[PDB]
Amino acid sequence: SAVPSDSQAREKLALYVYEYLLHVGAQKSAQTFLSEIRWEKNITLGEPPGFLHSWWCVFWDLYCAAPERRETCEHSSEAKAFHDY
């Protein structure tokens, strides 16, 4: 609902970075993070690689779209197609 507060966004980012650390193979850092920030709520996570990883990777893919860099850095074709067409 409504607009996320800065607190809510920081919390969602923290949990999704925890899930990222888990799926990237950083269990030690995952729990060191969980209490270096004093997390107290019950966790549940989705399939690997996780929310943050998947969305970030399609972002960086769309990053090499027709405007600016385009064909200068390796990139997908489906992304450039999502941009141009």
Partner 1 sequence: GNQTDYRIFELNKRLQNWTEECDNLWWDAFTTEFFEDDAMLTITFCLEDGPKRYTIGRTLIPRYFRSIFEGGATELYYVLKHPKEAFHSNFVSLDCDQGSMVTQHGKPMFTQVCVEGRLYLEFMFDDMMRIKTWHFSIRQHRELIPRSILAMHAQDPQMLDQLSKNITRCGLSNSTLNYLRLCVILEPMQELMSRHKTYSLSPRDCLKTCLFQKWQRMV
Site residue total, partner 1 (CB under 8 A):
23
In the complex, least distance from residue 62 CB atom to partner 1, rounded to whole angstroms: 5
Taking CA atoms, 33 is separated from 43, 54, 76, in Å, by 13, 21, 33
Near partner 1 by CB under 8 A: residue from 10, 12, 66, 69? 66
Tell me the Ramachandran region of residue 25: left when phi exceeds 0, alpha when psi lies from -120 to 50, beta otherwise.
left
Please give the residue ranges that form the binding site for partner 1 (CB under 8 A).
3-6, 9, 54-55, 57-59, 61-63, 65-68, 78-79, 81-83, 85
